């Protein structure tokens, strides 16, 4: 049943997009924190 298979994939996609955004935002924070610590070590 396509209409169901289509809807299933659309919902899976919506959830993945939201998940990808949250993880990208986490990575962004983690990179900035790593860089801060790397530079702190460089600087002192």
């Amino acid at each position: 049943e396509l209409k169901k298979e289509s809807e299933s994939l659309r919902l899976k996609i919506l959830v993945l997009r939201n998940e990808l955004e949250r993880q990208k935002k986490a990575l962004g924070r983690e990179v900035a924190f790593l860089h801060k610590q790397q530079m702190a070590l460089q600087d002192k």
């Binding site: 289509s6 996609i13 997009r17 993880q23 990179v31 610590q37 790397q38």
Partner: protein, 48 residues
């Protein structure tokens, strides 16, 4: 019916690309954690 079959194939490729992208972000987060721990381990050495 044809269109909707072509549609289904394109949605699967998009779903797969999002899954791959999430995988790749996790790969990145893992490296960042590993490198953070090495920097912290060295900082702790110096602070003693």
């Amino acid at each position: 019916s044809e269109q909707l079959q072509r549609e289904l194939k394109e949605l699967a490729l998009e779903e797969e690309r999002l899954i791959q992208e999430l995988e790749d972000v996790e790969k990145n987060r893992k490296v960042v954690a590993e490198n953070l721990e090495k920097v912290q381990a060295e900082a702790e050495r110096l602070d003693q």
